[PDB]
Design a protein around this ligand. Structure first.
Ligand SMILES: [K+]
Ligand SMILES: [Mg+2]
Ligand SMILES: [Mg+2]
Ligand SMILES: [Mg+2]
Ligand SMILES: [Mg+2]
Ligand SMILES: [Mg+2]
Ligand SMILES: [Mg+2]
Ligand SMILES: [Mg+2]
Ligand SMILES: [Mg+2]
Ligand SMILES: [Mg+2]
Ligand SMILES: [Mg+2]
Ligand SMILES: [Mg+2]
Ligand SMILES: [Mg+2]
Ligand SMILES: [Mg+2]
Ligand SMILES: [Mg+2]
Ligand SMILES: [Mg+2]
Ligand code: NA
Ligand code: NA
Lengths: 221, 402, 153
RNA sequence: CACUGACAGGGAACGUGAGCUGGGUUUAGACCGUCGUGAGACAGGUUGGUUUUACCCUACUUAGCUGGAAAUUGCGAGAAAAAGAUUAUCCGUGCAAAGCGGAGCGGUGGGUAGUACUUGGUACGCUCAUCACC
RNA sequence: UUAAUGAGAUUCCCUCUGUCCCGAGUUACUAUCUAGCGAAACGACAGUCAAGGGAACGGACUUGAAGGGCUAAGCGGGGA
RNA sequence: GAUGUGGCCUGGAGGUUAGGACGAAGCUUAUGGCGUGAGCCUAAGAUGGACCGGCCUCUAGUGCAGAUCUUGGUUGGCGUAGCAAAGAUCUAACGGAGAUAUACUCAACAUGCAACGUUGGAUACUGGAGCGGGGAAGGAUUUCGUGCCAACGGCACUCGUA
RNA sequence: AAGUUUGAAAAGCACUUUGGAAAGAGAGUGAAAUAGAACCUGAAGUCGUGACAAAGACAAUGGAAGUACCUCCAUUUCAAG
């Protein structure tokens, strides 16, 4: 939504700074779909603002064929007398996640609508989110603690591209360029990181001794 | 209970809704797949329909009982004055679709192009593109053009040019419009840099139809059908009429549904708009790409018929007039009436069948009158049948007294 | 006694008509459109409606009337051209103008400030229907009141 | 009986009468057989016998106008966006290493001679002419 | 049993044809838009669907799916 | 379904005690207060204009949401359905309040429309089993002249069997 | 079917101005014209107008508990209290 000229005029008249609300960014790679949705819905009802990234890397238990058949069963539901009114079946992974969350909220009530409107979802990590701070995970909903390793599992983007999503290659190319850029920058910052590490290692000789003793006693040596 | 006897349903459900088209021009909804190996080239052109006629040719088709024999085929004539290129656009891919990056405008534009931004051009201040025109030539405007061309080079995957028609060159008296028609034409072939180079070379210049299409290929046609207003179910959908003794009228559908579902379904035929729909039509073979009459008067003369004549029939195309520019001759019919603007597009389907690969050589083109039952091919032929008439005798007796 | 009072009585003119034999629903729409207008503008509009170059917008009592382009200037798609109501409202405006002149005010400065149309008592005729039935055929007349004030430049 | 590759079976208030038709069935008239003293009867035959209303809501088909992200409010600030004295020179480069760079020459009208284009209308070289930016 | 007669009931043949294959074009009066005039019937409240259970065929109840507001011409699925 | 209630309310009678032109009854309400409730009481009327409240006894044609209830009045549908058999009018002048009806600016069009009686002219219809001319039954002033145009002549009227 | 029940008294609206007229705007009588001729009082239902409150599609109405804004209402307190 483009801001209106009245908003721009008011912001100029007030002369304030650039405001950003408190937002949590969740990296959804290798998370269990239902458990992540169940946690996110409760936090939205408690009043947080949440953005999820990398929705194409969610996981579902079972084989890809079984999960694809479940989706096709969903797709065949259709209002016979007028399909422009019947259920709308979204095929992108972020829309799949949003529907799963919407089903765990009181959608008809306004409170539920506010909670649902406080969530934003993406495939991959977009450039307006990349630099906003460290991402988070949900420990009670991660695959390596939720599934027994010997069983098969599904990857949501792979399931979605066979039922109709048509942007898998675009997302893959974008993620490749993203990871290359971030890696080059990380390597470029190594001299700075090492200089700060050395400075902390060496200030222990120039500080007073009785402070160093307190550091050692509390285990910060 | 099941129906006693069965038949296929009436009408195609993939052409719904039967509503009026959003615009009057034909617009290509998709372009043929880009093959980076080829040389960069344009993929469409705009033309105007001017009547139809018929031709004679010999057929080259082994195995057919018509092999090496003469057939008569009806054709459509479409007038094609050159288009002018005024801008360049580029698109980038996103997880939600294609997005426009920017536009590079030409340094000068035509009055006919600029008329397209007004409803009353004559009684206005006529200031379109004046600020852009003066800003684009300073030091900063050049920098901005360089920036946007570099953004095309870095991030674009699709390149299109903005082009428009030339009604002043069309010179037709029944096409009332004076503001140009504008459309994007995609550039296919080569790499992104080669596409940009071609599009920048042909900026502010004009393009002929013969540089987009060749004589014996095929094309797709995008256009809007003729309108008929509100139509009843018998004409709109082709359902059967009821018996003579039916109370309350015969041109109806007798039963519009069962008790359950307690609803009327979207599959039942009802009265409404018919015509004025957009359609894309598939394999139209080009039979002739004709030069302008001012350049070559013998437009309809063939190798077998040595009579000198033009493509315009005696008495003119009914409701249209004379064809004065370059033109294209297509086999068969196209949607829409005379005087409507249509889009030719390079084909999508495979072009490997024998009928599509055949080479076409015309032997006779008909130029008799389309008013009545025309029986003369030229005015000289008519003058040979009738000798001098009374009007001529009077003219030659009153133009000699002086 | 009108349902509203002018702010300054000395700079105002009144007019009224009772049991007028014009349709209440047509006169309602015809009179309500001039409410905020200057007097000369209202008179020009009525002349142009008689000439059929502009229309009266029908906003409340408009169930299944025709659509017209001349309603676009009022933000509507439905309007008509009721001549019987228009001529009666022209007469009422002339009376109010005469009252203002006699009080010594300048008619080129008056602004209409109050307009109100009401249903009056009905008259009865009858119509004859199939199988020997008789059914009502009634007339619906109206009361109209208005006042205008001098604007202060 | 004939054609065909083929002449499968079913459901939708035994789909479908303000959609039709009205041959049958199911009023009053009349004839026959059987039955009944009789008036009359027959899950027996026969012939003749008014098919009413939509302008309301929804559904469906097409056809117009118009608000709106706190889905009409809060001032309640989230860009599939750019990167930097806290987003306050310009290109090039990899969120590099280096390398550039910062009167003039633009929009308009007047002469002046050649060219290009589908050939009446636009550009282009000089030349003043008013406005310009920097 | 019967010639003649019948707005009586039945079957076949010739002629003929928009009854039909299979629909198309045209006219006059409507409908449609305007000026004037101006009713009735009906009217608990209302009026988007799927499945469930229920006086075992829901607009209102349970769980899901939809649904921005206001309008013109039609139409006969539902309003048992 | 039974019963109780110094339980509530309405018209009239016997007693008693009060109020009213410094405003009775009736009516109106984002007028509060009291009562579990039926209800009672106060406030304001920029409402009204002559009667009437409490308490104890007596008396009854004594309390309404519905009966396809009775009578009066309203109302959505609705400016909707429609006002489509009997072919048809046009033109000028005169008449009439029925016009050629205007704020700036503006020659005239784009800002007073629509409709009427009479005379002349034109064009058609009835077509002698006639929208011709006389009578019976039935009706009873509808007949004639001058005016008038509120109602009536399902549109209109300067006209009329009004 | 239908109270003629305007007012104490017709004192039943002279005169000016707009209009073809009906009427309107002023002026006047009367204690009162929101007592102006079928004229005391003048309810409900329905409708017009001005101001204000909001408000998606959740039919509307309804219960409970708060809050925002208003309040021609009531009551209590203002200094030793
Ligand atoms: K109508
Ligand atoms: Mg047409
Ligand atoms: Mg019939
Ligand atoms: Mg012809
Ligand atoms: Mg209608
Ligand atoms: Mg009748
Ligand atoms: Mg009768
Ligand atoms: Mg129905
Ligand atoms: Mg119908
Ligand atoms: Mg009683
Ligand atoms: Mg009652
Ligand atoms: Mg009619
Ligand atoms: Mg007729
Ligand atoms: Mg005749
Ligand atoms: Mg009349
Ligand atoms: Mg009274
Ligand atoms: Na017997
Ligand atoms: Na009594």
């Amino acid at each position: 939504a483009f801001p209106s000229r009245k908003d721009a005029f008011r912001a100029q008249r007030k002369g304030a700074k650039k405001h950003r609300p408190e937002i949590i960014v969740i990296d959804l790679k290798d998370h269990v779909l239902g458990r992540a949705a169940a946690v996110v819905a409760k936090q939205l009802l408690l009043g947080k603002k949440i953005t999820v990234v990398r929705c194409e890397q969610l996981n579902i238990a079972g084989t890809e064929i079984r999960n694809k058949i479940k989706y096709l069963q969903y797709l065949r539901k259709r209002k016979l007398t007028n399909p422009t009114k019947g259920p709308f079946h979204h095929r992108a992974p972020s829309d799949v996640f949003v529907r799963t969350v919407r089903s765990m909220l009181p959608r008809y009530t306004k409170r539920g609508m506010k909670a649902l409107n406080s969530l934003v979802a993406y495939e991959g990590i977009p450039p307006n989110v990349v630099r906003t701070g460290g991402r988070v995970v949900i420990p009670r909903a991660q695959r390596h603690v939720c599934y027994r390793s010997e069983r098969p599992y599904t990857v949501l983007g792979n399931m979605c591209k066979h039922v109709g999503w048509k942007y898998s290659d675009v997302v893959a190319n974008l993620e490749k360029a993203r990871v290359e850029k971030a890696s080059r920058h990380h390597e470029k910052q190594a001299k700075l990181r090492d200089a700060w590490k050395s400075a902390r290692k060496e200030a222990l000789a120039k500080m007073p001794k009785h402070n160093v003793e307190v550091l050692k006693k509390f285990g910060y040596a | 209970s099941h129906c006693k006897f069965e038949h296929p349903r009436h009408g195609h459900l993939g052409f719904l809704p039967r509503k009026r088209s959003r615009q009057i021009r034909g617009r290509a909804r998709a372009f043929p797949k880009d093959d980076a190996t080829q040389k960069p080239h344009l993929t469409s052109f705009m033309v105007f329909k001017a009547g139809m006629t018929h031709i004679v040719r010999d057929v080259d088709r082994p195995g057919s009982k018509v092999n090496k024999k003469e057939v008569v085929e009806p054709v459509t004539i479409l007038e094609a004055p050159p288009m002018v290129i005024v801008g360049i656009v580029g698109y980038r891919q996103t997880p939600v679709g294609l997005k426009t990056i920017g536009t590079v405008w030409a340094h000068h534009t035509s009055v006919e192009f600029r008329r397209r931004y007004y409803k009353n051009w004559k009684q206005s201040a006529q200031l379109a593109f004046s600020r852009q025109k003066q800003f684009a030539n300073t030091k900063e405007g050049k920098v901005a053009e360089a920036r946007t061309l570099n953004a095309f080079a870095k991030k674009a995957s699709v390149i299109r040019v903005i082009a428009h028609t030339q009604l002043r060159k069309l010179r037709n008296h029944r096409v009332g419009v004076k503001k140009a028609h504008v459309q994007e034409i995609q550039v296919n072939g080569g790499s992104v840099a080669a596409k940009i180079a071609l599009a920048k070379s042909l900026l502010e210049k004009e393009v002929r139809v013969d540089s987009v299409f060749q004589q014996s290929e095929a094309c797709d046609v995008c256009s809007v059908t003729k309108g008929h207003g509100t139509e009843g179910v018998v004409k709109r959908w082709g359902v059967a009429c009821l018996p003579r003794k039916t109370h309350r009228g015969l041109r109806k559908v007798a039963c519009i549904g069962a008790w359950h579902p307690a609803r009327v379904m979207y599959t039942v035929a009802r009265a409404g708009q018919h015509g004025y729909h957009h359609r894309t039509q598939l394999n139209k073979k080009i039979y002739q790409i004709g030069r302008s009459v001012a350049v070559e008067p013998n437009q309809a003369t063939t190798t077998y018929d040595l009579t000198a004549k033009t493509i315009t029939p005696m008495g003119g195309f009914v409701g249209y007039g004379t064809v004065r520019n370059d033109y294209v001759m297509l086999k068969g019919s196209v949607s829409g009436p005379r005087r409507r603007v249509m889009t030719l597009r390079r084909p999508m389907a495979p072009q490997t069948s024998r009928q599509l690969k055949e080479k076409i050589v015309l032997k006779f083109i008909d130029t008799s009158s389309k008013i009545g039952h025309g029986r003369f091919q030229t005015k000289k032929e008519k003058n040979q049948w009738f000798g001098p008439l009374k009007k001529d005798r009077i003219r030659r007796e009153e133009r000699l007294r002086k | 006694h009108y349902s509203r009072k002018p702010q300054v009585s000395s700079k105002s003119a009144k007019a009224k008509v009772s049991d007028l034999r014009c349709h209440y629903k047509n006169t309602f729409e015809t009179a309500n459109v001039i409410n905020g207008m200057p007097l000369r503008k209202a008179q020009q509009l009525y002349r142009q409606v008689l000439a059929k170059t502009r229309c009266i917008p029908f906003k409340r009592y408009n169930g299944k009337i025709g659509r017209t382009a001349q309603a676009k200037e009022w933000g509507q798609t439905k309007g008509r051209w009721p001549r019987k109501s228009v001529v009666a409202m022209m007469s009422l405006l002339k009376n109010a103008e005469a009252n203002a002149i006699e009080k010594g005010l300048d008619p080129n400065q008056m602004v209409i400030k109050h307009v109100q149309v009401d249903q009056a008592a009905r008259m009865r005729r009858r119509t004859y229907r199939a199988h020997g039935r008789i059914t009502p055929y009634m007339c619906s007349p109206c009361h109209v009141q208005l006042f205008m004030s001098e604007k202060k430049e």
